[PDB]
Amino acid sequence: MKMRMATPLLMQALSGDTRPRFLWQLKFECHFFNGTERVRLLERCIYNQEESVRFDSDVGEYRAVTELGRPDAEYWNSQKDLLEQRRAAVDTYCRHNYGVGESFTVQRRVEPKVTVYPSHHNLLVCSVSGFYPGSIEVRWFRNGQEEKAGVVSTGLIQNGDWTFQTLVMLETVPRSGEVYTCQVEHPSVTSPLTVEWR
Amino acid sequence: EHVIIQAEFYLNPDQSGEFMFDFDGDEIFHVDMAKKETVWRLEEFGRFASFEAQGALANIAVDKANLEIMTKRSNYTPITNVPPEVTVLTNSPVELREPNVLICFIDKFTPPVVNVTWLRNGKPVTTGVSETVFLPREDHLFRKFHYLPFLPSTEDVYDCRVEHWGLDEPLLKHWEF
């Protein structure tokens, strides 16, 4: 299916490199709650690094963020057909694009590969790689007991390629009979993934 | 809860534009401005969805026009360079002679212009490298990934060298087995 694009409104008309730069950024943000049940559109216009003017579907019109954005907010708000265009965009654009890409974004699931290996005495690494989506839980167990002390985590690392990874390490003073378990809980699998080390 | 972002920019005087979609922080696609072509971030996406590339060029033209208006309206106030922080890491745990990928993560910078070199034992390498376009951040800075596939050895070292107008020296992030 064809993804739709939103179109920025035009503003009103009146060896080395040491030249200054000028940056204009435009963002249309479609925010989805419970699928397309609740949808908010946020159009952000940004000069250099400062958002100057925005459209917020919950407000229904442009609002100046800085004094710089003021004439745009007023010029665009003076165009009634344009505003109702943007107002309807939550359907014609956000809900539409959500529908087009749903199957390979929202429904995307890739199973993590989980390994355990050594790096008081012994530091254990639970490596959890190449999964999607990011929402996940990694838990360490000593025999039957969950251990949260002496644990260090990188946190969620986004690989840039629609995969994530994370490394969670556990300081151990290993004893006789101790089984250490790394447990992973992720939407890709119904049961937990567990890997044991002795 | 999910977020889809259509992010565009134009930059003067480089006269550089970009146009991309982001889903929860990952790029869905961008448009090659030169080829007038839709470039899906994962090839498989183009099997389910399509996008009319020509429209991005029209959007970018409007952005350019608007940038020029705002530049004059600001009375030529220029951007303040924000240098990047850079992290080098591998795609997976490193096993000898199991092929892997070096990731160079370039984060929290603006304006969106960088020069990235992969170094191996002090020498530039280009074989098999790839990169992403400039990815948006909530604070309106940028992200970017560069990749270098490689075979792990106990005798190679690597560097990702990154240059940006906000750094006093080229930044160099080392990695080795």
Curated annotation (Swiss-Prot), chain A:
Disulphide bridges: 30-94, 126-182
Protein name per its UniProtKB record: HLA class II histocompatibility antigen, DRB1 beta chain
Species for this entry: Homo sapiens
Impact noted for substituting residue 93 to V: In allele DRB1*07:01 and allele DRB1*09:01; requires 2 nucleotide substitutions
Entry comment describing in which tissues the protein is expressed: Expressed in professional APCs: monocyte/macrophages, dendritic cells and B cells (at protein level). Expressed in thymic epithelial cells (at protein level).
Any one Gene Ontology cellular component term annotated for this protein: cell surface
Impact reported for residue 89 to Q: In allele DRB1*07:01; requires 2 nucleotide substitutions
Impact upon substituting residue 113 to E: In allele DRB1*04:01, allele DRB1*04:02, allele DRB1*04:04, allele DRB1*04:05, allele DRB1*04:06, allele DRB1*04:07, allele DRB1*04:08, allele DRB1*04:10, allele DRB1*04:11, allele DRB1*07:01 and allele DRB1*09:01
Compartmental location: Cell membrane; Endoplasmic reticulum membrane; Lysosome membrane; Late endosome membrane
Residues of the full protein shown: 30 to 218 of 266
GO BP: antigen processing and presentation of endogenous peptide antigen via MHC class II; antigen processing and presentation of exogenous peptide antigen via MHC class II; detection of bacterium; epidermis development; humoral immune response; immune response; inflammatory response to antigenic stimulus; macrophage differentiation
Job description of the protein: A beta chain of antigen-presenting major histocompatibility complex class II (MHCII) molecule. In complex with the alpha chain HLA-DRA, displays antigenic peptides on professional antigen presenting cells (APCs) for recognition by alpha-beta T cell receptor (TCR) on HLA-DRB1-restricted CD4-positive T cells. This guides antigen-specific T-helper effector functions, both antibody-mediated immune response and macrophage activation, to ultimately eliminate the infectious agents and transformed cells.
Region (Beta-2): 111-198
Membrane topology designation: Single-pass type I membrane protein
Every Ig-like C1-type domain range: 112-194
Keyword field contains S-adenosyl-L-methionine: no
Keyword Signal attached: yes
Swiss-Prot record, chain B:
Annotated site residue numbers, Self- and pathogen-derived peptide antigen: 6, 48, 50, 59, 73
Effect of residue 50 to D/H: Decreases the interaction with HLA-DM complex and peptide exchange
Top-level taxon: Eukaryota
Effect caused by changing residue 87 to R: Decreases the interaction with CD4
GO biological process: adaptive immune response; antigen processing and presentation of endogenous peptide antigen via MHC class II; antigen processing and presentation of exogenous peptide antigen via MHC class II; antigen processing and presentation of peptide or polysaccharide antigen via MHC class II; cognition; immune response; myeloid dendritic cell antigen processing and presentation; peptide antigen assembly with MHC class II protein complex
Residues carrying sugar: 75, 115
Record note on domains: The alpha-1 domain is a structural part of the peptide-binding cleft. It contains one alpha helix and 4 beta sheets, respectively forming part of the wall and the floor of the peptide-binding cleft. The other 4 beta sheets of the floor and the second alpha helix wall is formed by the beta-1 domain of HLA-DRB. Forms hydrogen bonds with the peptide main chain via conserved amino acids. The peptide-bound alpha-1 domain forms hydrogen bonds with CDR2 and CDR3 alpha-domain of TCR.
Provenance organism: Homo sapiens
Primary gene name: HLA-DRA
Protein name per Swiss-Prot or TrEMBL: HLA class II histocompatibility antigen, DR alpha chain
Annotated site residues (Self-peptide antigen) in this chain: 46, 49
Described function: An alpha chain of antigen-presenting major histocompatibility complex class II (MHCII) molecule. In complex with the beta chain HLA-DRB, displays antigenic peptides on professional antigen presenting cells (APCs) for recognition by alpha-beta T cell receptor (TCR) on HLA-DR-restricted CD4-positive T cells. This guides antigen-specific T-helper effector functions, both antibody-mediated immune response and macrophage activation, to ultimately eliminate the infectious agents and transformed cells.
Region (Alpha-1): 1-81
Induction: Up-regulated in dendritic cells upon maturation.
Family: Belongs to the MHC class II family.
Cellular compartments annotated: Cell membrane; Endoplasmic reticulum membrane; Early endosome membrane; Late endosome membrane
Keyword Metal-binding in record: no
SS bonds (residue pairs): 104-160
Tissues/organs with expression: Expressed in professional APCs: macrophages, dendritic cells and B cells (at protein level). Expressed in thymic epithelial cells (at protein level).
SUBUNIT field: Heterotrimer that consists of an alpha chain HLA-DRA, a beta chain HLA-DRB and a peptide (peptide-MHCII). Newly synthesized alpha and beta chains forms a heterodimer (MHCII) that associates with the CD74/invariant chain (Ii) in the endoplasmic reticulum (ER). Ii is a trimer composed of three subunits and each subunit interacts with one MHCII dimer, blocking the peptide-binding cleft. As a result, MHCII molecules cannot bind peptides present in the ER. (Microbial infection) Interacts with Epstein-Barr virus BZLF2/gp42.
Domain Ig-like C1-type: 84-176
Intervals, Extracellular compartment: 1-177
